[PDB]
């Protein structure tokens, strides 16, 4: 599952 | 408010006419609150998630607030639905949840609609 925290960490290319 | 969707993807800088990562045209999805945009594939969304996020006022990761209480507190506890990307605090669910599940977790709105 994703949380905001884990999602931030796995989508590191977002500006 | 003063929001206007950005016409470029935060990840690859391409517009909807050309995703620079894939080399294909691809629509952008844009945050309802801040206007930042991304190609769904750059956001790593499935195709069905892509369709879902276009049906409501989707928020980007930074803006995401809990559907149930409206806050953006406790990022470590704000689950994102794996079918629609809406955010829900584990402690706003009933029964509340101690830890993010392994593998997919989907929200009650999606459970009602798709099952
Ligand atoms: Zn892109
Ligand atoms: Zn946003
Ligand atoms: Zn909440
Ligand atoms: Zn959902």
């Amino acid at each position: 599952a994703r949380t905001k925290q884990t999602a931030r960490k796995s989508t590191g290319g977002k500006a | 408010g003063t929001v206007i969707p950005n016409n470029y993807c935060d990840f690859c800088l391409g517009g909807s006419n050309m995703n620079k990562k894939s080399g294909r045209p691809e629509e952008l999805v844009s945050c309802a609150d801040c206007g930042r945009s991304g190609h769904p594939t750059c956001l790593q969304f499935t195709l069905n998630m892509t369709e879902a996020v276009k049906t409501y006022k989707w928020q980007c990761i930074e803006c995401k607030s809990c559907i149930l209480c409206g806050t953006s507190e406790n990022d470590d506890q704000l689950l994102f639905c794996d079918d629609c990307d809406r955010g829900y605090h584990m402690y706003c669910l009933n029964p509340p949840v101690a830890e993010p599940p392994e593998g997919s977790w989907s929200c009650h709105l999606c459970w009602e609609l798709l099952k």
Side-chain angles (χ1 to χ4, degrees), chain A, chain B residues 1-98 100-101 103-114:
Chain A
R2 298 178 295 141
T3 65
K4 181 177 297 204
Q5 174 153 184
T6 69
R8 245 183 213 122
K9 296 177 167 169
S10 60
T11 72
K14 174 164 185 85
Chain B
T2 81
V3 192
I4 295 314
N6 285 1
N7 71 359
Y8 65 92
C9 174
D10 274 351
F11 299 89
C12 73
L13 303 186
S16 56
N17 67 309
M18 183 57 57
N19 178 325
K20 297 195 182 298
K21 177 182 203 161
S22 67
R24 302 163 69 79
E26 182 176 355
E27 85 292 60
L28 292 166
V29 297
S30 308
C31 178
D33 290 347
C34 74
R36 289 170 170 273
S37 299
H39 298 109
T41 62
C42 292
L43 287 157
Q44 299 183 352
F45 288 170
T46 64
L47 296 163
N48 195 74
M49 177 164 294
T50 296
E51 291 309 297
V53 302
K54 296 175 184 173
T55 69
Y56 76 96
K57 298 182 192 169
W58 175 81
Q59 295 168 304
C60 75
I61 288 167
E62 296 302 320
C63 293
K64 197 86 73 188
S65 55
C66 175
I67 288 296
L68 300 173
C69 71
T71 86
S72 54
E73 296 295 320
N74 290 313
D75 297 351
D76 57 315
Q77 295 207 71
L78 188 70
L79 285 171
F80 291 4
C81 176
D82 288 321
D83 280 285
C84 73
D85 216 42
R86 285 176 179 94
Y88 299 83
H89 290 116
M90 285 185 300
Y91 53 78
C92 287
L93 304 177
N94 191 20
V97 172
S104 324
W105 175 84
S106 295
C107 77
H108 75 286
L109 297 178
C110 291
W111 274 97
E112 287 186 347
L113 169 77
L114 296 169

